[model samples]
Target chain A: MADVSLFFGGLPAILLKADTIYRIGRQKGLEISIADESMELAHATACILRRGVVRLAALVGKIFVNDQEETVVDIGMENAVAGKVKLRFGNVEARLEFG
Target chain B: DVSLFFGGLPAILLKADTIYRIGRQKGLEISIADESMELAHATACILRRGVVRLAALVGKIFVNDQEETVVDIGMENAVAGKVKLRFGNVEARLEFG
Candidate 1:
C-alpha cells in the first residue's frame, strides 16, 4: 500500500488525512474508516497511480465516483469538490488530492 | 448549481461546489430504487482530467442521443454541451454550471 497526499490544508481536508493508503469502511480500526453500518466491511481503497495521480476503487461494493457508478475512478483530475476527488462508500464519504 | 431532469418531473437542482452520489444506496444525495441498477451505481461532478478542462462521470450516458461512458463537459463541447443518461430505462438529463 502506497501513500497518497490529500488536500487537508483547507476546511474539507480536516475531515480526512493525507498520506498512506486508506481503505474506507466500517470494519473498525481502519486508517480512515467511517462508522456507518450501510458500508461494507472493507469497501473502497484510495491509492496513487502513474503520472503521480490517484484513484479510488470498490473492493466489496460499488462506489459512486462523483455522481455515477464506477469500479475505478480517477481523482482530482476534473472539476471537483474542494479541488479534490470526492467519494462515497455506503453512508460515509471521503476526498483526496493527488498530483 | 446544476439541474437534473428525470422523466417528466421538474428538475432536481444540485448545489454548487458539492458532490452527489446517485443510486439505490441510502443516505445519498440522490437515491433511487431500481432493481435493475446497482446499489451504488454512479457519481457525478464537475472535474478537470487536464486532458479535458471539464468532465463528468457519464456512465451509460448518451450525448445528443448517442452513448458514451464519460463525457467532456463544458458550455462549448459535447453536442452543445449536454448529455442524457439512461440506466435500466431510467433516463435523466444534466445541465452544466
Candidate 2:
C-alpha cells in the first residue's frame, strides 16, 4: 500500500514508499535529512501521497499532529487506524502508517 | 532479496513482498527513536508496493544473530528476505530484491 516512517537520532528508522517522490530537507536530492540548521536545504517537507495521503509542507518548522501544531496536515488514508498518523518537525519526527 | 546498510554505507537492494519500516512510530511500520524511546520506537522489515511487513517495538527480532523473535512489535509473516538484521549497532540486509 502506502507508508512513511522517518525518525533519526541514533539512526535505524527510515522507511518510505508511496510510489516515490520525497524530498524532506537538508538538501542533496533529499530522501529525508533533518539535522537542522534552521532547516531548508531542500525542505519539501511532507508529500507522501498515493493511498496513505499526507501533504504537510513545512517551509521551516511547526507541523505537529497529535501534539497539536500545524502549517499543513492532510492525512487521509480513509482516516487511518493502525498507522495512527503522528508527525513533528522542529525536533524532527515522522509517522504515517497506512493500510 | 533485501539489503539496506547504513553504517558502512553501500547496500540498498530490496524487493520481496516489499514492506520495510523500522521505527519511532512515524505512523506505523517503522520509525526508530531516541531520547530514551517512543517516536515509533523499535522493529524491522517494511517495503511497501511489493510487500514485506515485519515489525517490533520495545524490541526483539534477530535472525543471523539468533533470538528469532520475542515479546511483541507486530507483523511476522510474508517470508523470504534472506536475513541479517541487528539493531542497536545497525547492520541491515535481508535479501530477495
Candidate 3:
C-alpha cells in the first residue's frame, strides 16, 4: 500500500501524515490479520476523531485476537470505549461498537 | 512498581492538554492530571500519523505516590513514532534534555 497522509482537526489542531493502507494476512470477520503500518494510524486517528481533540491519547490497553494482541486505542467517552466507530480499509473493515 | 521509558532518560511529570480541544472540551486525562492549554495546542499541531501518546507536565515530579493534587498531566497528541508533551513546572531545558 502506498503511503497516504490525512489530517484531523482544523489548522492549528490538525494531525498530519497518518497511515491509511493495509496488507491483510488472514481474514475472519472482525478478526483479520493486518500489518502494523496498516492500522497503526487508523487506531490513533479514530481515537483523536472520537475525542475531537488529539494529544494525551495513549495505547494504554489493548485487545487480543486469536492470541494476537492489538493495542486498544485510547477511547475517551464510554460509547467510544464500546467501539461505536467503524474502521474500514478497502475490503477489510472493523467495527468498534458500543457494548 | 512499573517503570516508564521515553526517548530521553528518567520520565518527568508535567501538565499539558490538546490543541484541538483548545476552545472545545475541558481536557483529556493522561497518567493522572489535566494537561495545559499551550501544550495541548502545540501537540495538536505535531501529531502526524498513527496514534501518539503524550503526557502533560504540571508540577514537580513528586516521588511520593500519595500526593495527588500536586500532579498534573493530559494527552498532548497522538501520532505514530512520538507525541508532543507539555511540562508546566519544570524548566524547558530540564524537561526535554
Candidate 4:
C-alpha cells in the first residue's frame, strides 16, 4: 500500500455524503473520478482524524478534497459513541465510515 | 500546598472561582483565593438552601442545597482526588490543606 497524505477544508455544518474519496485524490495529485476507488486510498484519507468529543463550531465550514472526489459531511454530536468519528454539527454518537 | 492532577474528560479545565449549579435555587461557588492559581483548586462549596449547610453533603459534593451531577470531586489526605459522580459521568480528584 502506498502512504499518501490528504488535505481538505471548507466542510459544511451537516453531513450528507462522503468526502474521503475526494480528499485522498487531491492529496495524491490525481484527478477527481470514481475510478480512483480502485486505489483503496479513500479509506485511508477518511481516517486521518481520530475520534474525540469536541464543541460545536470547531469543525464547521471545513472541506476535504482528494484525487478522486470532493464532498462534505457533518460533525456528529448527539449519539456520539466512543472512538467514533462524527461528521455533524450539533451532536452525534456513532463512528462514521469512509465511503 | 496546592497540586494539579489529571482526570477524565481530558478537555475541561477547572478553576477555583467558577460558579456551577449544585441544586434547584442553589449555586455552589468555589471560594478559593485568586492569589493561588493552579491546575486544580482544593475547595468545597457547601450546599445551602437558605442559611444552613445541608447535611446531605457528607456523602458527596453538593451545591446550593441540591445534589450535583458534575464537578463533584473528592479529597484524600489533604489532596484533591478525582471522583466519578454516579450521575455526572465525570472523574476528577482534589485535596485540601
Candidate 5:
C-alpha cells in the first residue's frame, strides 16, 4: 500500500512502483532489476522472484526470511515468516531475518 | 520443464529456471491445497537442466523419504516417474518432461 524498494549486497537501492506483485529477475524489463551482472545472485537466476509487495521502510534484516544454499527464496506479502536466514553468492553474503 | 503435483490437483508445469512459490492463499506462483499450509509454504525451481531444487518455507520437506528443508534432486528420477515427498500428510512429487 506504500512505497516499495529493495537493496541487496551493496548495489544501488531499487525503488519500486508496483502495488501488487512485481517480477524480480536477473533479466531486463523486470520491475526490480539492477541490470548489473551482480544481480544474478541476488535474484537467483533467470525468472524466479515475482512476488507480492509489502514492507516496513528501513527494513534492517526484515521480511519473511529463509536461507538458501542452492535455490533463491523470498517472503510473501503481509505475512511474517518465523526464522533467521542468509542468502549467499558472488564472493559475498546476504542476510535474512523473521519472527 | 517439470510438473509439480500438490495433493490431488492437476500438475503445474514449471519451466526452466522459474521458481514456483506454492502457498495456501495469496501471492502465489503455484498454489497448492490449503490445509496445514502456510501463507507461503514452499518453492520449486530448476536450478539448471535436470537439476531440481525444492525449498520449504516453514519447515523441512521430505525428499526421497529423507527430511530436508532445502534439497536438490536429479530430474532423472522425475522424468522416469516421480520424486515423491510429503507436505504435512499431503503427498507431492515432481516429474520432468
Candidate 6:
C-alpha cells in the first residue's frame, strides 16, 4: 500500500492512503489548512497515485520537494520508502511512505 | 524541568499552552486539520514532574543538548538543564538552571 503523511514543524499529523486526493488550503473542504492570511484558500492538491507515485500540484503558494521548488511533481515510491522525499509549502510538509 | 511538544502539517495552524489530547478526530480536544478524518490518538500529555515523559504513539522524536543528541522517547523526558526537542516539524528547546 502507498501512504502519504503530512508533517507540521516536523510532526506527523495527517496520513493519506492510495488512490485518494487531499486538498490543502485555508478552507473546510481542504484536508489541511495553513490558516495564514497570506496562505491561499486553495493552496495545493496531493494525489496518491495508485501506481506508487505521489503527485503534488500547487494551487497557491510555492511547492518545494527535497528543498527544490516546483509547480508540479511526480515522486516515485522508492524515494519515499527510503524516507528521502519531503514536500513543503508554507508551514506544511508532506512525505510518502510505501509498505 | 517539564515541556510539551506538538506539531503536524500546516505547521503554523494551531497553538496551545496547556495539556490536551491531539489526533485526527473531533474527539481530540485539540483537533488537527486532517481533512476531517480520524486517526489514532498520537499523543496525550501535560506538564508534570520535574521531567515530563511523552507517549509518541506515532512519528519520530529527538532531543539535542549542548553535549549530544538523544533520539525518540529518550528525547521525551526533559532534563533540568538546557535542551532542544525536535518533533516531526517543530523545534522546541528549553533551558532550566
Stretches > 4 Å off in candidate 5: A1-6, A9-24, A28-32, A45-99, B76-80
* Rank ordering of all candidates by TM-score, starting from the highest: 5, 6, 1, 2, 3, 4
Model 6 residue B48 CA deviation in Å: 50
How is the predicted docking of candidate 2 categorized under the CAPRI scheme?
A: incorrect
- Residue-wise lDDT of candidate 2 within A12-79, one digit each (tens)? 66666543434466655456766676554434344454455655544333456767886545676665
Error of 3 at B35 (Å): 12
lDDT of 3 at B84: 33
Best by TM-score: 5
Better of 2 and 6 by DockQ: 2
Candidate 2 chain A has its poorest 10 consecutive residues by lDDT at A41-50
Candidate 6 at residue A62, lDDT? 59
B26 in model 1: Cα distance from truth in Å?
A: 2.9
- True-structure lDDT of candidate 1: 0.51
Query: For residues A1-99, what per-residue lDDT tens digits would candidate 4 score against the true structure?
Result: 112222122322222221111212212432221122222222211221123211111111122221112122223333233423433211211224222
lDDT of 1 by residue, A1-99 (tens): 222354322323423223224555566665455566777655655544334455565655457756577766765445355456665666555555533
Tens-digit lDDT track for model 3 on B15-86?
222221121123332222234223222112122322223322112222122222112222332123233332
Instruction: Assess candidate 3 and give its TM-score to the true structure.
Output: 0.22
Runs of candidate 1 exceeding 4 Å displacement: A1-99, B48-59, B78-82
Fnat for the candidates in order: 0.00, 0.00, 0.03, 0.00, 0.00, 0.00
Residue-level lDDT of model 5, residues B37-93, one tens digit each, is 654455566666666766665434777777776667775555366788876556787
User: What lDDT score is found at residue B6 in candidate 4?
Assistant: 28
- How much does each candidate deviate at the interface, measured as C-alpha RMSD after superposition? 11.8, 13.6, 13.7, 19.9, 9.6, 15.9
| Per-candidate DockQ vs. reference | 0.02, 0.04, 0.02, 0.01, 0.06, 0.01
lDDT of 1 by residue, B33-89 (tens): 766544444445433321121112222445566655444455565344455666545
